[PDB]
RNA sequence: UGUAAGUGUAAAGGCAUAAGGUAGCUUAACUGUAAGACUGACAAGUCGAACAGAUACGAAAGUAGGUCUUAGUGAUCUGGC
RNA sequence: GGACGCUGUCUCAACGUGGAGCUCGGUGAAAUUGAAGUAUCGGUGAAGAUGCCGAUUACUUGUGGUUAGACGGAAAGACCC
RNA sequence: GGGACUGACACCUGCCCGGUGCUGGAAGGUUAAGAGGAGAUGUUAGUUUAUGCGAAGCAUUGAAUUUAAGCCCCAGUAAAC
RNA sequence: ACAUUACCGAAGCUUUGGAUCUUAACGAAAGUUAAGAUGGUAGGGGAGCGUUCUGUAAGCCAGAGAAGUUAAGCUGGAAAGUUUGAUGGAGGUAUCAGAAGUGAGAAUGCAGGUAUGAGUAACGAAAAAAUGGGUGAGAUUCCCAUUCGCCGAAAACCUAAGGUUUCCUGGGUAAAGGUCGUCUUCCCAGGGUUAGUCGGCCCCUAAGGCAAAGCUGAAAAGUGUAGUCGAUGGGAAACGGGUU
RNA sequence: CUCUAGUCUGUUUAAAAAGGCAGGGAUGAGCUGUGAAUAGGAGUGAAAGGCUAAACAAACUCGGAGAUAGCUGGUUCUCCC
RNA sequence: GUCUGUAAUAAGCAAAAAAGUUACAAAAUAUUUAUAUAGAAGAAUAAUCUGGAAAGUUUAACCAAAGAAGGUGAUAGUCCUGUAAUUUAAAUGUAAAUAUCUUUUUAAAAUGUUCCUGAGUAGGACGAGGCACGAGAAACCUUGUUUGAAGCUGGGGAGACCACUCUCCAAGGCUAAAUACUAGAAAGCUACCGAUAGAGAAGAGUACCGUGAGGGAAAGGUGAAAAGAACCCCGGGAGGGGAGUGAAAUAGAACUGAAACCGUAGACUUACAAGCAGUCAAAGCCGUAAUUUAUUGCGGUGAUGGCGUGCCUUUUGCAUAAUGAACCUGCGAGUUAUCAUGUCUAGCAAGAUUAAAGCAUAGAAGUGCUGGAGUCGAAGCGAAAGCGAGUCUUAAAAGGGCGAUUU
RNA sequence: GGAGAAGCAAACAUUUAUUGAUCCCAAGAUUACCGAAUGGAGUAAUCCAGCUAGCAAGAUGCUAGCUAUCUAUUAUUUAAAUAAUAGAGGCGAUACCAGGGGAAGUGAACCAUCUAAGUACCCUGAGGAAAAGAAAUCAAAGAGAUUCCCUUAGUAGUGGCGA
């Protein structure tokens, strides 16, 4: 209890985790002008997404808890 | 950091000709603190119950197995606290020169103030073992007070 | 929990000593120049050991050849017809033979003449 | 003679069924999606049949989710509508 | 910057004097040091060799001198980045 | 009495006030806190068939008006930079 | 240069043993055979040697000789291990389990000891010594005598600032003296400093410090008057000779 | 009596800045004795980035402190894959 | 109860309780075999062997509420000091309990009327601080500069604010225990150190260094007992050679005495030679053992031949003339505490497990029960409400993302 | 408590002790001078005194006893001034506690917000503990002062939403 792992509070703000592993995250590119980008690109950044199985690793390094 | 003296550089980092050094304290100097020594610190820790609980019984269970060295002998109690009483009784059952480990099924307090000087005994209460003294003991004397109190002890 | 007994150094120095007695100068009690000596000595003991083979094989050729000398068989030719006649016989034993029994060895020659 | 011309804009790859020129009507310069892929450290980028809603043109079959294609772009945080 | 006088500054060095140096007796350091039955030449090689190759030369060991080398000693280059 | 620059003495010390400083001057342009509460917002007794509106109280707010120095501006000053 | 037949030549290949691992087969397993595969920095995995301490251990091995060092011999695939002499004169160790301040050749590492240069440079200013006698185990160096030389607005004499017994007498030569030493400012013991006039103390103030009150500051304190200290200054008084 | 131009010696020095030849001032902006005063971002400075206890482009002592180094150095028994 | 005597209440006296630990304060006593600062008693071995010496070997006992630990000529339960369980207090300190004494009540419930119930205070505005909360919609608390109320028909708080409702009563002052700490005094424990270790210091803040603040070492061991060498000999002494003491006199001012380093003696080799000094072959000579005996082995030296660019760092690459070490001996570097995750082992199992803490036992920082507060699994999806083996995206299981029924 | 003792250590002499020593515990006496140092001063361990008393008192003689400051309380027109008492001054503890002041080396791979951290240090106060403490409290549960552990929980939030 002297020493608990710190979970690190930027990364768990973005990052959520599935049952078995994976890392669902929000899509970039949707937050700022939006007028010129294609409708198929917009409807394509508003699903959310998992990411790739490389980062997977550090991710759980950084959300000791989560 | 704790070992008495200054923390001022012993001479300055370039052109004396000696090898660098930060204060007369470094672990390296003679007389100086000592890197990653012991500290105090806590070995205690506790087992699952339910480990200590089986190693209890498989302990039990390994001296019962020989007959002559595990022996049980009808309740009595040594009524003078003298020490020539018990130690008669002992000297007539142990046989192995060595270790002896008698158990009680109550705090008989006779028995064990007369019995806290022989040489080589160890007295045990049903309910305060030890399985470091009962591995270890080379003869094991047990009252049926004792057997009983032990078996609805760890049959629930 | 201190664990300081010294009695380990000490056993590899003097197994060191004893291994480098007869070494010319400080290479035989100093610690330093002596394990230093030992080491590159052992190796060259292994790699000594491999080229005997070579050396020996080499000196018995040069004696066939120089116990061939008289007669007018260049000893290529004398392992020539020495496998031709299928005689399997050794270097090392053709090179003591011409030293213990001269007579012998010219036999085989005059045999292997043919 | 047979694309050497011309394709808003550099160059390249293409362009006769024309993707070039002209005229009529028109707003698909759409909403929800998207099997399957290309390229890719990651973040990203790109193509996409087909389906529901509702249009434009056409007799219809069908085409249209901007521009012949590939450059004209900017993450997150903060704030405004 | 020039001139006079004066001179071993020089042509051009020689001799003498005092303290060291040299020998013996007494006392007795130093930086330095992987050690060492540590030659030269033409080569070779982390591109300048006591240590490698080929060849040449050289009895063993000291002392007084001389610094060409041991990229000599001394100061984790001050210049440059 | 303090500061700056020059440096006995002799003859002299020319031109430039745009730039940047310093001195003086407020007619305007601009400008903070403090006064000033147009108006807007939340709450609700009540009204409204009810929403909507919504008095008072309690709060969150804010414009037009007022306002100093400074800056812009108007001059002077080089043995001021 | 072109032909014929050879030989030499590596840790390559073959042959002769021996070790481990993988796979496959045999085998009840254990293991036995068939095949191949075992250079290696950074780096990953596995198996061991040795050291200290605790339990096992109120055990076992030691005064008939324990640990430790030392000599010879022997053994294991490596860390390493155990037998016998000599030394040593009092504590060690087998099996299993546990815990680390657990293994050193280097950090211009730290500490101690000892080499090297080397019996080499130096022995601290170009004022200078010589002989005789004496003392003594021992004399270029100490004492005395006779000569010589040096300083002489000093290298002489007397008081400060400073040192603190270094002063005198007797005794001594571990060490210290850049040599020697009977000598010394070195060591040991004892002795030695006598004030109305000298220098202080004291009565005075300068530079300056402190400072009730007053004033100002988170605190500590800072300024600051009356007062009090503060000589390098101003203030009563002695000279000559002799003596250890 | 005070300072150090020129030159030489010294340079593992007799001396952690001196010595031998000499030189400048020497009735004054002179030299010197004994006290006292000014302290670290401060003092003092006839002005050299000089001096403030042999070290000053920000003293020394203790403490934060085992400061931090993407830099340099070191990191101890064995065998098998 | 303004004065006197009457219906009508207060100031004092019977009747009880609390108190120096807050709740009023000050003590004095005796009383307690309560305790602290000295003490008292305290169990039970002889022989034999080796040896300088016995406690040890061997054969037999004996004590034990005492086999904790030291010393004694080698290793002691029974030799000594002590240890277990008991116990000494005139005097003093500290504790309780008892009364002395002290103070207080000399009563309580019963209904509405006017009064009181903490003011420059609550709060507001501005500039700051403390709340985990950095102005953020910023509550709450403290505050400097200013402004400023209500008075129970009241006021504060409930993370801007308002309403209703719910809770509490500020602007007065006190309070033991659970807690933190040990320079130290007493009694102990140790998988803590054993003289480069442990406190800097087994002899010390000393020697020494600095004007000062301050910095700061090194040096332990004769034997069981001085029984410290009578006396003689060489020598000025020192030192040594005998004689004595001792088990040992290379124990004689010091146990064991290694390596670096310095020697002496003997064996062999070396003055025609170019050697990271070693390795592989190898005659002669010396020592020793065999085979009857001059040939083989093991040993030591070694003429001569082949091969051979120290080691460690750092580098594309080092014999490198790149770095580092004078040599030897000691000391000198992935450790500890917690959390995350993986593996191995052990146990249980859709369940696993206690943390703090309490009691018993004895004094023996144990281990046995008790302790289910909590944590991780058992359901997921979505920003969330919400719905759930489904859910999100949308009207669409229409298709997808994440799930799963297969733990 | 009982037979040696003259410290930490004996030497080599000379006494002490059974008339109960040495030693140990408790109380008491003595207790030079300096130091908060306090009669004034000062270069701490030393000068200068006043008043009273005793030494033949006396000429810079000696020994004793008083004469510092601050706060509170009264004897006063608490101020000025004494007087009367009571309590403070300094040290320890290179620890703990409360209050006041309050960094920086660092991390953010710069750095200024932020961090380090209310840590180091300084200053003023106390105590055996200190501080806090008997709701104008928590917080959506119905609990009932303060303080210290276990959990909630590395969660809620917060942050150039960076560390």
Same mark, same amino acid.
């Given at each position: 209890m002297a020493n608990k792992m710190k979970t690190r509070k930027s990364a768990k703000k973005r990052y959520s985790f599935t049952v078995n592993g994976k890392v669902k995250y929000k899509k970039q590119?949707?937050?700022?002008?939006?007028? =010129? =980008?294609?409708s198929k690109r917009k409807r394509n950044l508003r699903k959310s997404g998992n990411l790739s199985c490389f980062e997977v690793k550090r991710i759980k390094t950084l959300l000791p808890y989560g | 950091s704790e070992v008495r003296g200054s923390s001022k550089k012993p001479w300055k980092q370039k052109g004396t000709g000696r090898a660098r050094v930060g204060? +007369? #304290?470094?672990?390296?100097? !003679?007389?100086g603190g000592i890197a990653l020594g012991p500290k105090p610190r806590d070995y205690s820790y506790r087992l699952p119950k339910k480990v200590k609980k089986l190693a209890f019984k498989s302990v039990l269970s390994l001296r019962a197995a /020989?007959? %002559?060295?595990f022996k049980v002998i009808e309740n009595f109690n040594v009524e003078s606290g003298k020490t020539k009483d018990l130690a008669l009784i002992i000297k007539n059952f142990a046989s192995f020169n060595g270790k002896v480990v008698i158990l009680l099924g109550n705090d008989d307090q006779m028995i064990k103030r007369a019995g +806290? %000087? !022989? #040489? /080589?005994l160890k007295i045990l209460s049903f309910d305060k073992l030890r399985v470091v003294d009962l591995f270890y003991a080379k003869n094991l004397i047990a009252l049926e007070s004792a057997v009983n109190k032990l078996n609805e002890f760890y049959i629930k | 929990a201190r664990a300081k007994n010294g009695t380990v150094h000490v056993a590899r120095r003097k197994r060191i000593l004893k291994k480098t007695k007869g070494f010319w100068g400080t290479k035989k009690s100093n610690y330093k120049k002596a394990k230093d000596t030992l080491r590159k000595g052992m190796m060259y003991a292994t790699r000594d050991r491999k080229v005997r083979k070579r050396d020996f094989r080499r000196l018995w050729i040069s004696r066939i050849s120089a116990a061939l000398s008289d007669t007018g068989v260049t000893y290529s030719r004398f392992i020539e017809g020495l496998l031709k006649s299928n005689i399997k016989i050794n270097r090392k034993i053709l090179s003591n033979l011409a030293i213990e029994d001269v007579e012998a060895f010219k036999k085989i020659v005059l045999e292997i003449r043919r």
């Amino acid at each position: 209890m002297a020493n608990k792992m710190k979970t690190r509070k930027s990364a768990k703000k973005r990052y959520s985790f599935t049952v078995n592993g994976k890392v669902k995250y929000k899509k970039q590119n949707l937050r700022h002008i939006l007028t =010129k =980008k294609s409708s198929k690109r917009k409807r394509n950044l508003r699903k959310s997404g998992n990411l790739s199985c490389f980062e997977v690793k550090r991710i759980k390094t950084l959300l000791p808890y989560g | 950091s704790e070992v008495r003296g200054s923390s001022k550089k012993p001479w300055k980092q370039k052109g004396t000709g000696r090898a660098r050094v930060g204060t +007369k #304290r470094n672990p390296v100097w !003679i007389g100086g603190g000592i890197a990653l020594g012991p500290k105090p610190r806590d070995y205690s820790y506790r087992l699952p119950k339910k480990v200590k609980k089986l190693a209890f019984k498989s302990v039990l269970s390994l001296r019962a197995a /020989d007959e %002559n060295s595990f022996k049980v002998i009808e309740n009595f109690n040594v009524e003078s606290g003298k020490t020539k009483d018990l130690a008669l009784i002992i000297k007539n059952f142990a046989s192995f020169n060595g270790k002896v480990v008698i158990l009680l099924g109550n705090d008989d307090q006779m028995i064990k103030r007369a019995g +806290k %000087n !022989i #040489r /080589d005994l160890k007295i045990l209460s049903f309910d305060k073992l030890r399985v470091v003294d009962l591995f270890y003991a080379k003869n094991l004397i047990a009252l049926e007070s004792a057997v009983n109190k032990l078996n609805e002890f760890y049959i629930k | 929990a201190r664990a300081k007994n010294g009695t380990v150094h000490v056993a590899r120095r003097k197994r060191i000593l004893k291994k480098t007695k007869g070494f010319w100068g400080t290479k035989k009690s100093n610690y330093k120049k002596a394990k230093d000596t030992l080491r590159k000595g052992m190796m060259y003991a292994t790699r000594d050991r491999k080229v005997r083979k070579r050396d020996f094989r080499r000196l018995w050729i040069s004696r066939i050849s120089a116990a061939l000398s008289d007669t007018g068989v260049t000893y290529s030719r004398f392992i020539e017809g020495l496998l031709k006649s299928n005689i399997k016989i050794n270097r090392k034993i053709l090179s003591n033979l011409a030293i213990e029994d001269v007579e012998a060895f010219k036999k085989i020659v005059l045999e292997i003449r043919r």
